[PDB]
Design a protein around this ligand. Structure first.
Ligand SMILES: CN1C(=O)N(c2ccc(C#N)c(C(F)(F)F)c2)C(=O)[C@@]1(C)c1ccc(O)cc1
Lengths: 244, 11
């Protein structure tokens, strides 16, 4: 299992948010921590992605693009997995120091997004997703959202995404298999609408932020103002398996 | 940009 060997080897370790749990929850503190966590995870997505099989086949501009477009979906998927594996979906395990109960879901002003993410967490258990299926599905997620007008070297992308689909098929093969691929691609598709709702909520925050003084940190301000509106305006869209 | 700096800083 060469491919799985590699994905296990490069999988990033635990990441903390730096949140102060000794203080009562407030929207401002929760958002600062999500911003911090978000940036810390992005660093690890970059390290991870550059070490993926084939990733350097991509034009460097496309390498950079695909990470920024798919980072929120990658974080959603992984957070769902941690929630399932660490606490049986009873809460959302953003980080060991940032665990959301329903009161935090509410205080974050992202209650609906949180509920949908808790549902995603429960599906890992209903579907009995294996840790090896998780790793293959997460890698495929990186190659699941791109500009409608194409990437700089579309052909290299196409062949890379193909290989990751072949490798998910591989560990499903290794019929029932048909049913399995359906269930897993349905779950993957469901990540994208959730990421979009996170993007919409945060884009709106950023715009109003001069009165709400949400001091958006530099990396986040750049990605929310430069890259996220491409997704919100439809110029960048997920690659769905099934029709929505 | 910030993201490009970060991407380029990773081996
Ligand atoms: C509101 N946001 C949020 O929930 N986080 C966030 C941070 C870590 C995790 C984790 N793990 C998650 C996640 F779980 F939902 F995936 C969200 C973000 O990174 C943030 C800060 C954001 C930033 C930019 C953007 O375009 C959309 C959202």
């Amino acid at each position: 299992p060469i491919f799985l060997n590699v994905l296990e080897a490069i999988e990033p370790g635990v990441v903390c948010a730096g949140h102060d749990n000794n203080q009562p929850d407030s929207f401002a503190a929760l958002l600062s921590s999500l911003n911090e966590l978000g940036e810390r995870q992005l660093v690890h997505v970059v390290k991870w992605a550059k070490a993926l099989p084939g990733f350097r086949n991509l034009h460097v501009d496309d390498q950079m693009a695909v990470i920024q477009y798919s980072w929120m979906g990658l974080m959603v998927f992984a957070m769902g997995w941690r929630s399932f594996t660490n606490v049986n979906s009873r809460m959302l395990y953003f980080a060991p120091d940032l665990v959301f109960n329903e009161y935090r879901m509410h205080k974050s002003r992202m209650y609906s997004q949180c509920v949908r993410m808790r549902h995603l967490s429960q599906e890992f258990g209903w579907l009995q997703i294996t840790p090896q299926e998780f790793l293959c599905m997460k890698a495929l997620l990186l190659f699941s959202i791109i500009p409608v007008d194409g990437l700089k070297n579309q052909k290299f992308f196409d062949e890379l995404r193909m290989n990751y689909i072949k490798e998910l098929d591989r560990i499903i093969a290794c019929t029932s298999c048909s049913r399995r691929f359906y269930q897993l691609t349905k779950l993957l598709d469901s990540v994208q609408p959730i990421a979009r709702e996170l993007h919409q909520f945060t884009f709106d925050l950023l715009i109003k932020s001069h009165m709400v003084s949400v001091d958006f940190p530099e990396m986040m301000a750049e990605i929310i103002s430069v890259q996220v509106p491409k997704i919100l305006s439809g110029k960048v869209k997920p690659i769905y398996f099934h029709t929505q | 940009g910030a993201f490009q700096n970060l991407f380029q800083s990773v081996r």
